[PDB]
Design a protein around this ligand. Structure first.
Ligand SMILES: [Ca+2]
Ligand SMILES: [Ca+2]
Ligand SMILES: [Ca+2]
Length: 294
DNA sequence: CCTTTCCGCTTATTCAACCCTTTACCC
DNA sequence: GGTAAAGGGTTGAATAAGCGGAAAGGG
């Protein structure tokens, strides 16, 4: 039932997964607190099939709706988390997300030895939790810090499978219609982009060297910023990008976008993009891609 | 007989996707 | 001259991350 290649899956989890450690007030727990350790993926419902492919490839995880437009795969059963760990030991993450996995592995150790059933263990997990994802809430920071006391306190791209997973999460295949001082008054520019927060700047640099093309753009929106890896030089698209994903396939609905983008690349290589009829065929393809897909 | 697990649901922002202007390159 | 490539910029929602409530097997 191995619907998804394991490196593709590590790639897609580096893009979209999340490692969760909850420490909850519990009046009924001997220690005063209960714990939940989890791995999870939340996607738009149009990509349910990916989650079902993960779930059947791993044989763990519960699929459920998450709001009107999204679906989750959550793994919380403790012995099933051993499947998740074994996967990530064999096919390791490479983004900053690996730091969340490493903390996740440490909590798991605590919990395996049952120490989380004692206030000692809970405090160990609070320390683990403080650097994991968004850290401790105020209620929890406050419950475990006293007046006068102290406060609670990157790998290379392995292969194209990992890059196919990751792109299926964060990639964009875009046809750009540029107003131009050319005969037709429009230039067709193919754009491949991968977008990521600058905490992963070094991954972005590795994309340029791994693929042999492209460049990084610094993007800004008020107080928030991020990066894009971008490729538009047509010979690199044709000779580096397209063939890579033709061998190592994009998963989900994005596959249909990559198939359309490739159809435009064909028109471009035949020069039909410099014709009025070739142009209107590109327009029709573009409008039913991405946001415009029905 | 406490503790694990599931379930429905919510929130902030890092993503994806989008467009326009300028410069570089080469039958 | 005419096309390709790169520079320069935006937006809204699909992600990430994680809440509260409760089912259920268990002395
Ligand atoms: Ca991501
Ligand atoms: Ca995505
Ligand atoms: Ca994403």
């Amino acid at each position: 039932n191995e619907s998804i290649n394991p490196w593709v899956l590590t790639g897609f989890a580096d893009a979209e997964g999340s490692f969760i450690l909850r420490i909850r007030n519990n009046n009924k727990s001997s220690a005063g607190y209960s714990t939940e350790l989890g791995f999870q993926i939340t996607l738009h419902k149009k990509d349910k099939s990916i989650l079902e492919n993960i779930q059947s490839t791993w044989k763990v995880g519960v699929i459920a709706n998450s709001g009107d437009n999204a679906v989750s795969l959550k793994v919380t059963r403790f012995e099933d988390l051993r499947v998740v760990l074994n996967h990530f030991e064999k096919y390791p993450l490479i983004t900053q997300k690996l730091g969340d996995y490493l903390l996740f592995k440490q909590a798991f150790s605590v919990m395996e030895n049952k120490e989380h059933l004692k206030i000692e263990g809970i405090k160990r997990l609070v320390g683990i939790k403080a650097n994991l994802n968004w850290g401790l809430t105020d209620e929890l920071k406050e419950a475990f810090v006293a007046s006068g006391g102290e406060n609670i306190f990157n790998k290379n791209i392995p292969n194209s499978g990992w890059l196919a997973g990751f792109t299926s999460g964060e990639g964009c295949f875009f046809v750009s219609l540029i107003k131009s001082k050319s005969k037709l008054g429009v230039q067709v520019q193919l754009v491949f982009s991968i977008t990521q927060h600058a905490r992963d700047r070094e991954l972005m640099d590795n994309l340029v060297t791994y693929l042999g093309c492209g460049y990084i753009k610094e993007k800004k929106k008020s107080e928030f910023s991020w990066l894009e890896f971008v490729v538009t030089k047509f010979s690199d698209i044709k000779d580096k990008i397209i063939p890579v994903f033709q061998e190592n396939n994009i998963i989900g609905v994005k596959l249909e976008d990559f198939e359309d983008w490739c159809k435009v690349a064909k028109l471009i290589e035949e020069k039909k993009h410099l014709t009025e009829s070739g142009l209107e065929e590109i327009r029709n393809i573009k409008l039913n891609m991405n946001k415009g897909r029905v």
